[PDB]
Design a protein around this ligand. Structure first.
Ligand SMILES: C[n+]1cn([C@@H]2O[C@H](COP(=O)(O)OP(=O)(O)OP(=O)(O)OC[C@H]3O[C@@H](n4cnc5c(N)ncnc54)[C@H](O)[C@@H]3O)[C@@H](O)[C@H]2O)c2nc(N)[nH]c(=O)c21
Lengths: 191, 20
């Protein structure tokens, strides 16, 4: 007979995740300010990491944290983000004190807990952006043309964040990021 | 179809303690 697993084995997650950190410098290629921190594939290892890092709210504005599935870099150019998009959560100044941190953690839980049923396979990662003009949080998916999976994720996510239901959020494809001048950024889906 | 695989709910993850 062997020993009992629940007693000593760690709680494995669906996928192994990687945490990346961005530091602005506005004097270096965007890619060069992007650095990997570490990875993990268990609930315990997740908390070990989370517990020893600054709360997004305490970071110097201009930085971002990013949690994506191992193998998927947190950038548009990636094979898995190229055709994708993101559900964006735009916060106001005040919300940096009341919601940023909790919102970001809930995002993290949705990611590692695979809280979107089979549609959690279309998820690439999430990223938090600390900015003085207003913070932002977003969940990236691989195919912005996959409305069924995209609308499902948006709903659950918005519901998991618990923000007032009357507040609508939009989903935008990375490929349409304005490139002209403002050119007006828009949404493929809304919930 | 697809495979089941690991799905954790809020409570459980939080239950595993850490940052409340
Ligand atoms: C996620 N991401 C961000 N950047 C870079 O970071 C900048 C700031 O992007 P941010 O998501 O961190 O957003 P931020 O809060 O800091 O502020 P901000 O919105 O003011 O500006 C970005 C937006 O400006 C607009 N923009 C950028 N360049 C042009 C342009 N030439 N014409 C018109 N609009 C533009 C777009 O709507 C774009 O989404 C981008 O303009 C881009 O150079 C990236 N570069 C690569 N190569 N791959 C990436 O994955 C990536």
């Amino acid at each position: 007979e062997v020993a009992n697993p629940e007693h000593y084995i760690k709680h494995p997650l669906q996928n192994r995740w990687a945490l990346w950190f961005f530091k602005n410098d506005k004097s270096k290629t965007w890619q060069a300010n992007l650095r990997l921190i570490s990875k993990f594939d268990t609930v315990e290892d997740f908390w070990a990491l989370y517990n020893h890092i600054q709360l997004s709210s305490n970071l110097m504005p201009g930085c971002d944290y990013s949690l994506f599935k191992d193998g998927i870099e947190p950038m548009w150019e990636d094979e898995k983000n190229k055709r994708g998009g993101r559900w964006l959560i735009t916060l106001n100044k005040q919300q940096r004190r009341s919601d940023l941190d909790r919102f970001w953690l809930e995002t993290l839980l949705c990611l590692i807990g695979e809280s979107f049923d089979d549609y959690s396979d279309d998820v690439c990662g999430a990223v938090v952006n600390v900015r003085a003009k207003g913070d932002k949080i977003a969940i990236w998916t691989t195919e912005c043309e996959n409305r069924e999976a995209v609308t499902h994720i948006g709903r659950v996510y918005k519901e998991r964040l618990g923000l007032p239901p009357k507040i609508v959020i939009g989903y935008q494809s990375h490929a349409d990021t304005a490139t002209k001048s403002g050119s007006t950024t828009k949404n493929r889906f809304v919930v | 179809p697809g495979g089941t695989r690991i799905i954790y709910d809020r409570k459980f993850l939080m239950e595993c303690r850490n940052s409340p």
